[PDB]
Structures are given as C-alpha cells and as structure tokens.
C-alpha cells in the first residue's frame, strides 16, 4: 500500500484539480445503461421510475502514471471527490436522482476512468397502454448540463440497453430498450449539443 | 488545462469573493423561465408541483479577465460554488425546491455569468377548476429573500414564459404562461420581482 | 465592493468567532412571526403544518462598525454561517423543520442582525372542531433550546401576528394569531407562544 | 464574551478531544426520557412513532476549569460538535432518528455535560389491542451502539418516565411509561429499556 | 485518556489514509447479518423492507499497535470516518439504505476492525405467496461495489442469518433465512443473502 499512497499523492496533491474540458482540450464521455428495474409506475402524475447502472468513461493525462514508478500498480480506486467527474444529467427528470452505490471509481494508468453510479430516477413518461400486449414507450435523454459537444462529446459502445441483470420478477417486463447518442444545434450557436436518448418500451409482467 | 487551472486561480485563490450589491454599487440580474411540466396537483392542500429551468444572468467586473492573457480562453465552467450567486427564491413555496441539475455556471471573460438550476418546486395553488376548459391560473413571485431593488434589480427579457419544452404529455396542458416583473412599496425602497402566472387545465 | 470586501475581512477573518450570549453578557432576541399558510392538517396524528417567516432580530458589539471608514457602508447581507444566530426552536414540533428561504441575514453598523427564515412546520395540533363555525385552537412555544433567561431573554414587538400576506385561498382561515412572550420553568426560561384559531374555510 | 473566548480555546485547542472511555477509564452516562407525544401508529407495519427529549449527562475530567482562571464563568453552550458525545441507540428503531432541537449541549466547570436532543423515532411494536380499554404495551432499548458496559455503564436518576410535557391532546393516552436499566450477559451489556403502556384517547 | 489521545493521534495524523486494497494487496473482509425485521412489503412495485445489522470485520497491518507502547490500551472505538471501510453494497436495492445506528467501529491492536451497521434497505421482491401457508422467498447479494474479489475478497463466518434477534411481533414469520459465499466469472464474489417468509 506505501506505492498506491505515493501514487494517490503525486496524483492529487501536487497540481490543482483537473478543471474540466475546454474547446482546446475536449473529452469524450462514454456512456451505457444498465437496466435493472422499472419500479414504479404513476398514472396519476404521468411519472415512471427506473433502477439502474449508468456507467461513465473518461481518459485524462493528467491521471496517466507508469505503472515502472509505482510497484507495478496498474489501476486504483478512489472516491469519487477526488477526481472530476462529468456532469451528465437526465433532462426530464421529476426528482432528484437517488444513488444506490458508493461514488468510487476506478482510475487505470493510462488515464482512464470507469465510473459506475446506481441511481433511481423519477422521469416525465405517460404510462398509459402499459397494461397491453404492445406495452409503452417511455424515454429519457441524458447529456451534459453545462457543456456542448465542442467540450464533451458523448459516445455510446453500443445501442442495446444491457438487460442481462434485469429482475426477473418486475411488475414490468421489457420489450425493448435502446441508448442513441443524438446531435443537435440551436440557431443562436455553433456548437453541436449531444445527448444519449435512453429509450424503454415495457409492459406489465 | 494548463490556461484554465491558472486563470480560475487568479480569479478565485488571490481576493475574497465578490460580497453582493449594494445600495452604492447595484447589481442587474435577468430571469427567465423554461416550463416543463406541471408534475401533480394537490387539491386537498393547495400545493401543486411544476418542474422548471430557471435562467440566471448577471455580469460582475471582478470576473473580468483578458483572453489574451489565459491561452485565449473566453468563458469557462465551474462549480456554483466557486462564485457569488443571487438569492433568487420563490416567495409562496410549501416545501424545499428539489434541485435537478448539476450546480454549475458558465463564466464569460466580460464577466457575465449564467447559471440554469433546474428545479421542482411545491407552491400554493389552489386548483378548483382544472378539470374544466378554462382551467385555473396560479401564480408564484421569485425574488431577492434579502436584497432591495437597491441592490438587485430584477428583469426579464420576455413576459412569455419558454413552453417549447414543455411535456407533451403531462396530465396538464399549458394555456397560458407568463413571467413579468414587478416592484412593490411596503411601509422606503423599491422591492422588485418576477411574477410566474400560469393558467393550466387537465389534457 | 471594494469596502464591503475590507469590512467582511476585518469583521469576520480578523477575530474569534463570537460565542454566544452569557450571564454576564445577556442578549435579547426579538421574535416576530408572519403567518403564511397553514397548509396541512392530519386528524390522524393530530399533527399540523404551518408556513410562515420567523422575524429574528438581536445586537452585538463585536458586529459594529464606523460607516466612514467602509465608504459610507451602513448594513450589508451575508450569510447566516458568517456570524452566531441563536438556536430558537419550536418545543413541539414532530418533525424537523423544513427551510424555505436562503440562509443570509442583513448586519447593520450599529452591529444588529436582522434574519428571516422561512419554514415549514409540522407540529402538535388537534384539528378536531375545525370543521365548525368554531373553529379549533393550536400553540406551539418557541424558544432557546439552551439558553435560559439569563442569557436569552425574548421579546416580542407586539402580540399580533402578522396576517397580511396569509394565502387568501388557504383550505384554512385564521380566526386569530397571537405571539405572546411567557416564562417557564433551575433559571427562568422564556418563550413566544403561538397560538392560531382557525378554521376550513 | 472575552473570557469565555480565552476558555474555550483553553479547552479544545490545546489537546486532542477526549478519545471516548476505555475498560480502564471507564464512564458513566445518565439517562433520562421527557416523552412528548405518540404521534403515530401503523398497525399494517408494526411501527410506533414517538417524540420525547431524551435527557443525557456525562462527566469528563478534560471539561473541567477553575472558573476563577476565566472571569467566574461557571458554565457555557457549546455546540455539540465541539466535545464527545456517547453513541446512545435505540436497538429496535425502523428508520433513522429524527433530530429536532439544535446540537448544543451544556458544560459546567465540573466537568458535567448535559445534552438534551429531541427525537424523532420508529420503533417495532405491535399496537393490536391500543383501541381497547386495556391499552398496549410496547418498549424499546436505548443503549451505547459500540462500547460494553465494561466502557460506558448507564444510570437512570429515576425509572418513572418525565410525562409532564405530554401532548394532553395526543391520539394516545399514557397509561404507564417506564425507563428500567438492564444488564445482560466475560462483558456485560447495558441498556435503558423504555416501556410505554398506552390506548387510544 | 491520555495514553489513548497518543495512540489515536500515532495511528491516524501521522501517514496517509489506508488506500483500500489491491491485487498485491488484498483484504478479506467478512459479512454477517443479523435480521431484526421485515417491515413492510409492497406488492404494487415488488419491494420489500428489511431492517438488519450487518457485521463487517476485517484486519489492517497499518492499523496495529504494541500495547506495551499505549498503557496496555488493547483496543478502542472510533469514527468510522477515521478510518477506511469496504464499500458493501446491495446490489438490488431500490431506495437508498437509511442507516440507523451511530457510524463508529472497534480497532484492535493487531490491526483487526469490527464495523456493525444497522440498516434498513428496500429491495426488489415479489411478495406474492407471503399471504399462504408455503410464504415467499426472496434475495438481495451484498459485495464490494467497485472491487473484485482480487482486491476484496468476502466470506462469512456461517451461512446462517442470525435470528436470535428477529422481531417477535414481525408482520411476518422467517422461515429460513441464510447468508452465502457466490463466485461469479477477476472472479467477482458476493453474499447472497436469502430470506423465506410468511404472514404471520
């Protein structure tokens, strides 16, 4: 543990904090979703609520070590206020999100990182026909809150929601679920605007 | 990264924050509302719930910095922490406003600042007659909890409230929605704020 | 902001913080309530909500300073943190309050404070009769939770409670809203009863 | 305020806060219920809410002062965050304890500390039988979450629970409240099991 | 008081915080629970609230004393914010766990930490059957959150929940209830914590 503590030191209490990305110094964000359960249904308020993992990866030099100066240490996990992180956020959100897991995150000598929050979100979705054979399409856009596509560019590893730790005994069965990274632009700037469109369609179990 | 770490400590690690306006020295802050849902209505208590984005501008000197000087970085942006905020608070809400964003702004080098805290919020709206086609109107005024209109002065740039987010399928539709300013005399000073009136009924 | 930024370094980084009121330095608190709501009512628990601002007002030597020396600087607003607030609590609420309005009192040259709170109470209350032409009566006291009448003494400006931004369409009407400064029972403890009639509208 | 500035930078910035006892340097806590209020009751769950302050004193060595060293200061206020506190727990509670009075406790020049926090709790009880003249009985346990007796030992001053500050217009009527120490159980365990006979008013 | 202040400030004011574990260095931490209740099923949404107190032990080298060098002080309690702790997580909850006892642990001179806290967690259950006479089980696995079982691995001391203090007057009877070691392929290792029940 003496090198991992040398490590963290020379790390993060020699320079100031990474101040996040710039239009000089983008970051690519990757995001995925990791489906756990569809709680809770509200007909009255038009509200759904979703159980799940959004795994977030980054890269910054300023995390990059050689694993030769560090006893061969490759990778480290640290808490989650040690280090940046991206501001990605739900837009149609109707509470604040509730995390399920400690904010640690795993940060690898290349100057990557895996960050992996279990959150529930309350969301805008109107239910009705969930009750069907066809079911419901919901959906839900993430993006960063404060900045364009020229400072975070946000990317997906693949379009299929991963199902394979969905619960088998939800009041909700999944149809279909997909993460689309989507690109738009606003008249009054230049700069591209992403977002990952979380789209669930679902039925009563 | 090198550019950015320098100029945020100059901004921030050299003298205090900025203190607030004074009666000397005011300060302009413009508002403007992004209506996205009204969530739930509680007829029982008068409270009902709307999700919004608030729009906060206002421009301060000592956030003021040549580009030149930084690597040509014209804004940055950073914790709501890090600088002075207005004390924008909504004057009839039943419970805490429940945050939704991340709290950080975005800095520009002529010193302007704009911050977005999304938002829910409870306030008292008493809904008798939603359920018909003309709907009800509620309101809720936003202002300065501690500030005059000597030392804030509020303003919008439009009275109409921005709907074009507005959730399409919300158990209520949208039939009318303003944001407009206001000054009031009690019992010396000018106290200013933006009165949010919206008339809604069930889709 | 130049003088505002030197007097908040000399009043707040250039001294101990202030510690509270003592025997032999006594303060005296001015409470006054302005009633906004009552919001809630459960005849379950017999437990009812109010909204309203708490007035807060008290004085100390050690927040005075020379306008002339801060540019003519005569108040300024800062954060409830920066300085001592004293802890006036509700004796029979059921949970704890909930906090409307930003933290940040207004300090004025001859070193008084002037602090607002607004909150959301749920407290003991039976409703029972509330239904009635009648209507039913509630009080909650409040009070230094710590401090006896040898260090906090509390006072009111006048026993009425303020109703004029009470919300007109309230599921409730006040009959009436007095704030009456008492003293209970080592030492002598001091309270502001409030105590609201109301009705369904 | 000049000489209570200089004792408690005597008291908390010269050494390190007292660690917490030891099987060697062992301490005495005293406890003691003031039940308020049976606010609740939810017979689907088995869950009962009572509010109450709960009374606790402590002696330490490292508090104590010649209050003819600090102006005759015999006593002070100071947050709770400033000194130890024991981990007193109710055993059986079904949420977090909800706190409603300011964390702030009392230390006189003996070295006695008071601390008086008012609470929120849920605890398991099975209130079948509360709708019936005969009442229901339902406790709960209070004791330190990780010292043994052998490091905090518990004392009441009394086994009669405090019930002159009970909501005369509560849900409940209090037919008998009792605060009995128990040892059980290389050390031996201590607790102050809290017993409240009560019936719908 | 006195030689306990030394210790506390030799052990933790001198060196950097224990870092957490690592492939070359890696902690076995141990998990036992011991059910107090099931408080409350809801049916609409599948989820169910268990009240417990988890015990997690583990040994730390950066964390052991000489008695001889402390006024034979064998061990002490302390702030589990003093110290690291394993990220233990439910891996299906679906509220955050509200933590109901005081976040304090015991230290023992041979580097040995005791951490017990009581929780309440909502978990994700389908409760239909706790109403007849077979009742319902359900299961939630506890492990690390961000650590394989190369850096933290897990065991028990009993595949046994302990009832010895479970809630006479529960809504609901247990039928049984066990705690048990799964290795998933870095193995990946968690405690799967299962509970048959029934309406009493």
Redesign the interface.
Known sequence: ?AN??RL??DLFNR??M???P?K??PLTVTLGFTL??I??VDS????VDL?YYEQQRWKLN?LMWDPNEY???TD???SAADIWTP?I?AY?????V?????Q???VTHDGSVMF?P?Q?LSF???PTGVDSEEGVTCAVKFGS???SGF?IDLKTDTDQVDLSSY?A???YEILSATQTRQVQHYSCCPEPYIDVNLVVKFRER
């Open positions: 543990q991992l503590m963290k030191s320079s100031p990474y101040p996040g710039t000089d110094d756990q359960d709680v809770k009255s308020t038009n509200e159980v300023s006893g061969n240490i480290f996990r640290t501001d956020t149609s959100s109707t509470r604040p509730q995390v399920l897991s400690p640690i995150a795993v992996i279990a529930r805008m979705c109107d809150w404060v900045y400072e619960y005994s939800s009041k």
